[PDB]
Homo-oligomer: A and B are copies of this chain.
């Protein structure tokens, strides 16, 4: 289940995104709620620090902006 993909405390954000999208590929869900899972569920399940940074970026942030912003974690 996609709701079980949570970024580990040491896990790099790129690997977490990879697992999140891999499990995202099998999820049985409409394309709008999959867009909500990419935009919002990904942020909610990140580890604490990278979650703080990702929330700080506000709305509309791309996956590349999100990956650059968390590279200091």
List residues of A whose CB falls within 8 A of some B CB. Answer: 1, 3, 29-30, 32-33, 36, 40-41, 44
Alpha-carbon gap, A30 to B33, bound state (A): 9
Q: A36 to chain B: closest CB distance in Å?
A: 4
Q: A1 to chain B: closest CB distance in Å?
A: 6
Alpha-carbon gap, A1 to B55, bound state (A): 13
Q: Which residues of B contact A29 (CB under 8 A)?
A: 36, 40
Q: Which residues of B contact A30 (CB under 8 A)?
A: 32, 36
Q: A30 to chain B: closest CB distance in Å?
A: 6
Task: Tell me whether A1 and B44 are in contact (CB under 8 A).
Answer: yes
A and B contact pairs by CB, cutoff 8 A, 10 listed: A1-B44, A3-B41, A3-B44, A29-B36, A30-B32, A30-B36, A32-B32, A33-B33, A33-B36, A36-B36
